[PDB]
Amino acid sequence: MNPPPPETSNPNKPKRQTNQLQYLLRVVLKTLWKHQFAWPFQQPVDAVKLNLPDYYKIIKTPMDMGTIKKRLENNYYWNAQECIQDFNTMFTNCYIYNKPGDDIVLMAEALEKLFLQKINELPTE
Numbered sequence: 001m002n003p004p005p006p007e008t009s010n011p012n013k014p015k016r017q018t019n020q021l022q023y024l025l026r027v028v029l030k031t032l033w034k035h036q037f038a039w040p041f042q043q044p045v046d047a048v049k050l051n052l053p054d055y056y057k058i059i060k061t062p063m064d065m066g067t068i069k070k071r072l073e074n075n076y077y078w079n080a081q082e083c084i085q086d087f088n089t090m091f092t093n094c095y096i097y098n099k100p101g102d103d104i105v106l107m108a109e110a111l112e113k114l115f116l117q118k119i120n121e122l123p124t125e
């Protein structure tokens with residue numbers, strides 16, 4: 001059974017548009033998105049569809065690139081670090097729910113390395 005997906009808007013949360021957040025969407029997210037390993041990460045896990053009834057019993061802070069993309073597009077974040085934390089949560093969830101060697105973990109490992117390459121240098125404010 002599925003929990004609500006993470007929020008992509010929150011009227012009482014302060015918004016900010018920064019060069020670094022613009023970069024995270026235009027370059028970081030949209031480059032990862034096109035990777036051949038991106039597809040398991042482009043939407044919230046559907047435990048009913050994917051037959052993973054154990055997923056949300058294990059993962060308590062769900063995150064995915066679909067959610068991140070919407071947050072960036074909706075100006076949800078205050079700064080780039082907040083968005084980077086969502087990416088780190090997404091990767092960490094994968095490692096927690098699975099185990100070393102799994103096909104999905106090999107995918108997360110490759111995307112995480114590409115992610116780090118991209119955020120190594122960010123634009124200035």
Ligand SMILES: CCNc1ncnc2cc(OC)c(OC)cc12
Nearest residue numbers: 039040041045050093094097104
């Ligand atoms: C769209 C299909 N996605 C998936 N299919 C099979 N197993 C998955 C396992 C996962 O846990 C890390 C997962 O979330 C990243 C997506 C999975």
